[PDB]
Amino acid sequence: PMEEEEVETFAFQAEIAQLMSLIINTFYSNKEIFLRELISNSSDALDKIRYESLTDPSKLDSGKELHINLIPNKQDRTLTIVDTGIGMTKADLINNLGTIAKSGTKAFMEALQAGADISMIGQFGVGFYSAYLVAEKVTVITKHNDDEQYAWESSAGGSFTVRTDTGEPMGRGTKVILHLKEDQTEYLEERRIKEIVKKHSQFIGYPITLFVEKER
Numbered sequence: 001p002m003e004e005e006e007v008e009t010f011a012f013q014a015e016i017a018q019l020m021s022l023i024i025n026t027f028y029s030n031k032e033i034f035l036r037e038l039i040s041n042s043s044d045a046l047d048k049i050r051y052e053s054l055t056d057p058s059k060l061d062s063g064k065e066l067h068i069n070l071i072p073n074k075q076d077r078t079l080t081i082v083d084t085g086i087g088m089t090k091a092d093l094i095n096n097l098g099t100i101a102k103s104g105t106k107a108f109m110e111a112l113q114a115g116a117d118i119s120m121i122g123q124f125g126v127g128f129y130s131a132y133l134v135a136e137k138v139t140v141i142t143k144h145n146d147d148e149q150y151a152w153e154s155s156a157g158g159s160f161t162v163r164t165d166t167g168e169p170m171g172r173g174t175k176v177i178l179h180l181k182e183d184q185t186e187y188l189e190e191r192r193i194k195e196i197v198k199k200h201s202q203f204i205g206y207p208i209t210l211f212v213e214k215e216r
Ligand SMILES: Nc1ncnc2c1ncn2[C@@H]1O[C@H](COP(=O)(O)OP(=O)(O)NP(=O)(O)O)[C@@H](O)[C@H]1O
Pocket: 037, 041, 042, 044, 045, 083, 085, 086, 087, 088, 096, 097, 121, 122, 123, 124, 125, 126, 127, 128, 129, 173, 174
């Protein structure tokens, strides 16, 4: 029986779109800091559910372990960052990953134009879009307590989509799937992922596990 699924397509807020275009169409050295930014987001989401669970322990019914997993896939060219943090409601996805203006966007594009290192992006409140230094397409699957599981996706170009996810259930948290550009496949190698976690993410207060598919 054919299934029916609803999709909604949204426009990025105009300066977020301009920043995405700037990130994608300009050369930056130091692209490896995307991983730091995504791990920081996962750590922030883990802090949220940790503190929520102190006032309501049933918020951990959807899984007690608080951790971050990194999953490179050399066959389909994706790098996946999974956490068991708070997750995002449908409204959170829409608001927080693209529709609401961020006050630091303009400042950051001025800084980049003046020659700032792309590493400065976190300072400006727009760290997630560092994913587009290395990824042509990003898919965010997320499950928050008392909302359903949703998938956000964008290949930039000014729009993103949100749909209810009918894929593999996660109990609670967020998975960010980077579909890597062809020249950024270094970030599938275990050595390189270890190097950059050690460089940039060594004081995160939750365990990180790197899962490496047996070499083919
Ligand atoms: N893994 C995640 N779990 C839950 N929410 C997330 C996750 N990643 C991103 N978000 C949300 O997306 C928003 C935008 O993230 P981001 O662009 O990194 O900015 P920020 O983390 O708020 N500040 P910063 O990265 O320090 O510049 C966050 O504030 C969260 O609400």
